[PDB]
Design a protein around this ligand. Structure first.
Ligand SMILES: [Zn+2]
Ligand SMILES: [Zn+2]
Lengths: 150, 111, 217, 168, 8, 214, 121
């Protein structure tokens, strides 16, 4: 660690999280696909609060919903917020995935996404997989685990 | 008593019983005895053919052929010293001398 | 006992009391199994009979059975009597819902003391008792009925166990572990005990092959 | 003289208690994992350190009791053969057997031998040898000590000649 | 034969 | 990612079978295909059931997944169902197999016939080699799939190849039976041409024992 | 999480959608059979899973000699006759928690004090 720190165990902790590679797979409890046709207006009671909101109207989009549920414990342990994870998914599919998420002071951690006839859930179970396996949230590409020592 | 739990000492009587019955090389004896008594016949029923059909097999006790000669029984000591094979002959009742036929010699495992 | 160089752990030696299955025709058993409630596999509707035990012989799934407990009782009794060949391995894996039988050659097994309650008495005891030992000691002494190793098998006293069946039993090391200060010079032992023992070792020194049987201590 | 014996026996009984207390802990689901280690991994780690430091301090207890006229201790002091470890296995405690760097594996389904119940991670079960060569091993400790035994033999047999080949 | 990170 | 293997032998009384999970976790459509002897493709397990006369998705999954409530295993199978979707009956299933063991000149009749023969005699022969025993093999192959899956779903350990319960030590007897069988197969071969050569047997039995050569 | 089959074919049903009413149907692809969905959940993948943790809890669990037995009071009938086992998942990532089975009553309980389950597996 940079000369002049090295004793600061918490700065070590930070550097650890910045280096250790973590994907969505590392932080996700479960993934589900729902038919949830009214944008708008969810079927999931628990998500009405998060749908509230927006709240916008700023100035589409299938009935199928991919919904991930993230573990707060593994989130903290990797210095990850909702906005960080959210913004990371978002700038992977940029304008062809609609993505929102429950907030950091929200009780459950929840990401919702829709592809912006058929097919199509799957194409979507693929997106699901492209998500868990291949998005990098924090850290460096080969670095699987990082232990601190003194 | 009778009856009457066993002490650890008593193990060895059980063990002597085991070895008195089986000795030290029973997996050799047993395996080969199985082969001769049942497996050998089994192989010969798993054929015929066509009609020629093989029936019952007999295995003779160990014999040497020849010189000579002059087929006579063979004891292990003699087989060992004289560089022979301790074998017995095989014979099969066949369907259309009298009335088996000699098909070869089987090396016999001792005891 | 194993050679020191290349052959290490590849050449092995059998321990003093192991033997090797020689093979027995499985058909009487398969036959018995159906008499005893083994529903054939052309009957098995799983969604409709889920708690059923899968019954396997020599690797064949012959069918399914709704109360294996009773079947296993009888199967055990039959082998302990000599009606099934003692050489035959029979394993019930309860949690796994599988009952597996082996009648083929080349399975390596060893004998152990059977343990039952008793009766009686009672707690659980070995089925060998001093009266059996006497008959052995007295058939030994002569050199009257022969009381031989075979008598012990036939009277359900001792039983052959292969590595597979060994998966489903609990074995006491000393017969003394089947009952209810410490001398400083003794080595420390750990029991628990136990109350659930099905078998007991004849003598632990029996895990050794021929060579090592010669080393003192 | 044990004295020393009483103390060594008690030293081990102590480590069986720290290992028991960590089992109860981890079975309640109270043990916390560290970072980048499983529960089970970090459980094993604690158990192996307790067991090792018990062995260690039991061997130390024996070496202090050896007196100047003690012949083994004289070889040692002179430097002519052998070591702490030697004295310690002989007089105190053989200690933990290990194949592939872990404690004895469940080669039977969830047990190391059929004399144990399933899911038993006690020292006895996984090959801590408690007894010294002096007191002699129990059959279980005997077998596990053979397991550890073989692992070393195999590795000796793999250099002869893996090394006569490097040197060339 | 001694302990983990010593001998087998 | 995983294989379930049987080397089915006969008493008597050879032919290995492999059930393969074409997968790797975090790969799309993990299908299961089986390797049958003589067929030059792995066959989607669903086509095999349909070859054995088990036709509806419902009954095939029944043979494999014995708990109705196990949606997890069930879901590992959808790609298998989609994998054999083009084949909707026993004749089609047989041709599909048949074509993969048969040169392009060969007539439909005989194609099918080839696949029936393979399934009767070459597939799971330790169960049977005869005539109308298709329910037994279907359930057995279902059983293997179950076992493949319970492993892929981290519910059982992969099998331990060093478990002694699953070894066999061959001895004087069985060793001599394999020679004797071969050596009786000459002479028995031969004679299709007094006038029995007794030396066929004596020599080979003695050769193998003199040199240690099996 | 639950599977439906054709009434006629006993083949798998696949999710279609009624567009202009916005509801979920399952159709057969072997005939023209259709039905409404009993639930919008089409699919679910559990990265961190409990299923199979208690596999093997069968009527005859107690006549199993290889299983450890204890004294913990059954939280239902208060009987002190149980067997217990650790978790039957075969993951590295598992806890070391104990599952008990009440031999008098069949009830499954845990030593897990951070317990967020109700029913098991
Ligand atoms: Zn339909
Ligand atoms: Zn209860």
């Amino acid at each position: 660690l940079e000369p002049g720190h090295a004793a600061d165990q918490e700065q070590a902790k930070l550097i650890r999280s910045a280096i250790e590679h973590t994907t969505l797979k590392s932080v996700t409890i479960a993934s589900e696909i729902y038919y949830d046709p009214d944008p708008r207006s969810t079927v999931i009671p628990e998500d009405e609060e998060i749908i509230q909101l927006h709240f916008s109207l700023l100035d589409q989009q299938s009935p199928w919903l991919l919904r991930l549920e993230l573990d707060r414990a593994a989130m903290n342990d990797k210095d990850l917020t909702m906005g960080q994870v959210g913004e990371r998914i978002k700038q992977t599919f940029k304008n062809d995935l609609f993505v929102i998420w429950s907030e950091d002071n929200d009780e459950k951690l929840i990401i919702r996404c829709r592809v912006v006839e058929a097919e199509e859930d799957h194409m979507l179970k693929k997106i699901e997989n492209t998500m868990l396996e291949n998005i990098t949230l924090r850290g460096v590409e080969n670095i699987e685990r990082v232990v601190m020592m003194k | 008593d009778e009856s009457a739990p066993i002490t650890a000492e008593d193990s060895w009587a059980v063990i002597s019983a085991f070895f008195r019955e089986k000795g030290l090389v029973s997996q050799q004896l047993d395996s080969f005895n199985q082969f001769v008594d049942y497996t050998l016949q089994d192989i010969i029923c798993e054929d015929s053919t066509l009609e020629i059909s093989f029936g019952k097999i007999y295995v003779t006790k160990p014999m040497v052929n020849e010189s000579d000669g002059v087929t006579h029984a063979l004891y292990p000591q003699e087989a060992r010293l004289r560089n022979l094979t301790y074998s017995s002959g095989l014979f099969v009742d066949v369907k259309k001398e009298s009335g088996k036929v000699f098909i070869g010699r089987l090396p016999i495992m001792l005891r | 006992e194993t050679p020191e160089g290349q052959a290490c752990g590849l050449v092995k030696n059998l321990s003093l009391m192991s033997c090797i299955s020689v093979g027995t025709d499985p058909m009487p058993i398969i036959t018995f199994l159906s008499e005893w409630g083994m529903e054939p596999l052309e009957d098995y509707v799983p969604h409709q009979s889920p708690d059923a035990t899968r019954v396997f012989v020599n690797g064949v799934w012959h069918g399914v059975h709704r109360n294996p407990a009773r079947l296993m009782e009888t199967l055990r009794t039959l082998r302990r009597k000599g009606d099934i060949n003692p050489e035959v391995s029979m394993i019930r894996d309860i949690r796994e819902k599988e009952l597996k039988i082996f009648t083929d050659a080349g399975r390596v097994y060893r004998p152990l003391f059977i343990v039952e309650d008793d009766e009686s008495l009672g707690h659980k005891e070995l089925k060998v008792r001093k009266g059996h030992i006497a008959k052995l000691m007295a058939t030994e002494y002569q050199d009257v009925e022969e009381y031989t190793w075979s008598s012990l098998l036939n009277e359900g006293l001792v039983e052959y166990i292969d590595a597979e069946e060994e998966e489903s039993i609990l074995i006491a090391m000393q017969p003394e572990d089947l009952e209810p200060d410490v001398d400083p010079a003794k080595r420390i032992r750990v029991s628990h005990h136990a109350t659930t023992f099905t078998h007991c070792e004849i003598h632990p020194s029996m895990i050794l092959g021929v060579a090592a049987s010669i080393i003192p201590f | 003289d044990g004295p020393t014996m009483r103390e060594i026996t008690e030293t081990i009984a102590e480590a069986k208690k720290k290992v028991l207390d960590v089992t109860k802990e981890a079975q309640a689901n109270l043990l916390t994992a560290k970072h980048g280690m499983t529960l089970r991994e970090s459980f094993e780690d604690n158990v192996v350190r307790f067991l090792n430091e018990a062995r260690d301090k039991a061997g130390r207890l024996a070496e202090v009791n050896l007196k100047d006229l003690n012949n083994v201790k004289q070889m040692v002091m002179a430097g002519s053969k052998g070591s702490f470890i030697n004295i310690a296995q002989m007089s105190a405690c053989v200690g933990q057997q290990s194949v592939e760097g872990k404690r004895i594996a469940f080669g039977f389904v969830d047990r190391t031998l059929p004399h144990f119940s399933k899911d038993d991670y006690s020292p006895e079960s996984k090959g801590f040898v408690e007894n010294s060569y002096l007191r002699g091993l129990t059959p279980q400790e005997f077998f596990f000590h053979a397991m550890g035994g073989r692992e070393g033999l195999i590795d000796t047999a793999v250099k002869t000649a893996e090394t006569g080949y490097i040197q060339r | 034969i001694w302990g983990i990170g010593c001998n087998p | 990612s995983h294989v379930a293997e049987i080397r089915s032998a006969l008493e008597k009384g050879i032919s290995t079978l492999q059930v393969k999970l074409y997968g790797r976790e975090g790969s799309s459509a993990r299908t299961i295909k089986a390797t049958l002897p003589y067929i030059k493709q792995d066959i989607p397990i669903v086509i095999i059931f349909r070859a054995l006369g088990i036709i509806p998705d419902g009954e095939i999954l029944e043979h494999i997944c014995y708990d109705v409530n196990d949606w997890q295993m069930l879901e590992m199978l959808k790609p298998c169902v989609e994998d054999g979707f083009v084949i909707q009956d026993r004749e089609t299933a047989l041709d599909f197999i048949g074509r993969r063991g048969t040169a392009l000149g060969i007539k439909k009749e005989k194609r099918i016939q080839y696949a029936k023969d393979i399934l009767q005699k070459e597939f799971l022969p330790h169960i049977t080699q005869l005539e109308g025993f298709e329910s037994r093999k279907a359930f057995f192959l279902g059983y293997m799939i179950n076992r493949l899956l319970l492993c892929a779903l981290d519910r059982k350990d992969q099998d331990d190849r060093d478990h002694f319960g699953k070894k066999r030590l061959d001895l004087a007897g069985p060793l001599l039976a394999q020679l004797f069988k071969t050596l009786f197969k000459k002479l028995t071969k031969d004679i299709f041409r007094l006038a029995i050569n007794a030396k066929t047997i004596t020599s080979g039995l003695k050769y193998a024992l003199a040199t240690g050569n099996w | 999480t639950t599977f439906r089959f054709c009434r006629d074919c006993n083949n798998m049903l696949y999710p279609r959608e009624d567009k202009e009413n916005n509801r979920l149907l399952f159709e057969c692809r072997t005939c023209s059979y259709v039905e409404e969905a009993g639930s919008p959940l089409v699919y679910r993948h559990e990265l961190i899973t409990n299923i199979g943790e208690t596999a093997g809890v069968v009527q005859d669990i107690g006549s199993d000699p290889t299983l450890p037995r204890s004294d913990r009071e059954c939280p239902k009938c208060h009987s002190r006759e149980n067997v217990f086992f650790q978790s039957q998942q075969r993951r590295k990532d598992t806890s070391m928690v104990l599952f008990f089975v009440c031999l008098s009553c069949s009830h499954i309980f845990t030593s897990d004090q951070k317990n967020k389950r109700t029913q098991f597996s």
